Assembly symmetry: C3
């Protein structure tokens, strides 16, 4: 199960039922859980923390030092949870002193060439398309869908259930449940396909849609819009999430 | 010729005069033809079918399972023909039950980082630029030129002799002989440079140009335009290909 | 320091205090200087020339033959200087007969997936973001900052101290000290953040800003603008560099 043509530092901690292919390189100060599959020519570097049930494809590089020139050799980690699919040549750099941990959650698919920068946070259940670049200290909430070649600026946040269209770029927050597309990026309606696939009721979908008609299409500033959403849209956890996300948005939200 | 520092599963079928570098990983259920060169740290995975006379550069990954979450472990292949240049970190995933075979033809150049998704079809004589992403079940006809960082949506088709400009994205079909550029993508004239390089007559080039003036610049709907092309442009296989491609376009064509 | 699980051709010239990880592949006709660190699964190919004090991350490929189909097997090199950071899956192809040497200078950071084409020239002190593609025979002057997913057309030149925003593409020259952004790309003001960080005086910054107000915002053609800059902006090496760069621009400059 562990190929003798892998390089595995004696100090690496490796769980049970782990398959390691030839030409895998595993450093010291590495923790790997159970039921992982690490394919040929992958690199698991100093500071990596891997959970259970993941598949790491050829050429993936987990734990390299930050690309941030402010890095000065401080201790940090690069972490993934359980049941993720980490495709070919995906890079997940370890953290900087700004946070100290780059973290990916559970049940994500990071397609080939995806980059996860120092101190980034990915939740659970996300799909991130080919060669998308997530810059320093970003946050992706659960259940987001990001297409290929997306550029997410540092410090931004993406809400749950969004679909970001391929090739888009953005340097503001993207609030939950929306489609973000075009150049420059813009609110492009609700992710109705995603929400219907996930079994959201037509009524909840319509409420979400009405909240965003208020936010984006009623000529109201952000405070007034959120007031009106709170007054006029039948309340539910989904509507509270919209409101809370926007009200506390660190960057502001996209147009 | 075959490095002893390569890993080659005993069941892999390997032809004559094949050069395999150190740290190449070749799985079972692999067929490789004659006169291939496979460079260091390349991966040829379960289900790969490789023809003759190819060069596979370092870090290329052929045959990994689809990125489609609908994949359920069905048998499939990833295939390349003869005389291709498969550059660094090119990914060619094997197929899904939707078709079952990802196929690249002969005499293509897939530049570094190019992704070929499950069930895609590439013809012959194509050039595909750095990190271009071809999504599921796409079709590329012979002799196309696609620049770098292009995003081709699933189920789309690209006709012969096109030039798609760098960074463009599209989710409709691109008809033969044209330049497609800008954002949003658009018909940008004829690929006269390509056609002149390939020895097309000035007369045939002018006919093609006239067909597309009718299609794109005469205010006609698609049916009327194609009627008029068939009536007024001197007929040739090139003009029939334009007409047939557009008339049977599954997605519609770009604007 | 040199792993016995690396492949190193006996003819490769390797300097002192060089750390080489497992699964590194080093060819013949390679020169590597002192104090280098070459990480696992990197490839240093025929014709590579590496200076001192560099770090080459996993999956980087230095020296592969040009992607230019005009290449006919001529001798050429791929070269990097001193103190560079060459990140994961960076590709630096060797040259063609058009020049014969692909050259990267000193103290650069080439982030993951960056491509450096045949015969390209990179200076010193540059930062080039994730997966940026530099096409054939380009030139990057010292101290440039290029963000991620940038496409630089062949034969173009980028001046010092620019910031090119993420996802931009361009096929004209970019003159020194500016921000280039948007689609289509455009002059977007001065790189004041960069210049202030590097300790430029507020007075020199204001002069630069005034030169570009003349060039871009005064309705003057290029000759008249440069005449007026030479007459009205207090002279300094920075202003002479602006003027000289534009006056001798091979492609013309961006709008
Ligand atoms: C991660 C995954 O499994 N992706 C697969 C999935 O893509 P995906 O489900 O995106 O593709 P489909 O072609 O099924 O989707 C139809 C349309 O719905 C859109 N859409 C989809 C989901 C969503 O939450 N919001 C939304 O707006 C898509 O962008 C597309 O325009 O099916 C494709 C077609 O079989 C496959 O090639 C992809 O590999
Ligand atoms: C695959 C290949 O060999 N590419 C090489 C080729 O590019 P390519 O032939 O594209 O480059 P050139 O600079 O020769 O082309 C001149 C112009 O014609 C355009 N054009 C080209 C072909 C076409 O079918 N349609 C069209 O519109 C190009 O985009 C460019 O704007 O020459 C460049 C300059 O030596 C090299 O760096 C590239 O590596
Ligand atoms: C190579 C490097 O060390 N990059 C790091 C640096 O990026 P960088 O310095 O680019 O990031 P900052 O967030 O510090 O910059 C603030 C703003 O200034 C802009 N700007 C920056 C420099 C410049 O010359 N011109 C200019 O216009 C940036 O694009 C940004 O919009 O700090 C980020 C935030 O800690 C880190 O995640 C990056 O890894
Ligand atoms: Ca606040
Ligand atoms: Ca790689
Ligand atoms: Ca039909
Ligand atoms: Ca001249």
């Amino acid at each position: 199960m562990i190929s003798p043509l892998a390089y595995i530092h004696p100090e690496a901690k490796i769980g049970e039922n782990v398959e390691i292919a030839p030409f895998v390189y595993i450093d010291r100060n590495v923790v790997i859980g159970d039921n992982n599959k690490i394919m040929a020519n992958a690199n698991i570097l100093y500071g990596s923390r891997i959970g259970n049930g993941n598949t790491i494809f050829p050429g993936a590089v987990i734990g390299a030092i930050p690309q941030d020139l402010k890095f000065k050799g401080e201790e940090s980690t690069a972490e993934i949870g359980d049941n993720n699919l980490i495709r070919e040549n995906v890079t997940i750099n370890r953290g900087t002193a700004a946070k100290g941990r780059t973290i990916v959650g559970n049940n994500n698919l990071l397609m080939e060439g995806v980059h996860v920068a120092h101190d980034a946070l990915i939740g659970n259940g996300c799909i991130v398309g080919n060669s998308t670049k997530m810059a320093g200290e970003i946050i992706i909430d659960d259940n987001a869908i990001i297409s290929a070649n997306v550029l997410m600026h540092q410090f931004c946040r993406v809400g749950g259930y969004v679909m970001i269209q391929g090739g888009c770029r953005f340097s503001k927050d993207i609030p939950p449940y929306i489609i973000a597309g075009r150049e420059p990026i813009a609110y492009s309606g609700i992710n109705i396909i995603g929400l219907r696939r996930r079994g959201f009721s037509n009524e909840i979908i319509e409420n979400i849609h009405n909240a965003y008609r208020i936010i984006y299409q009623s000529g109201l500033n952000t405070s007034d819009a959120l007031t009106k959403v709170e007054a006029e849209v039948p309340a539910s956890p989904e509507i509270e999430y919209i409101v809370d996300f926007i009200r506390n948005s660190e960057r502001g939200i996209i147009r």
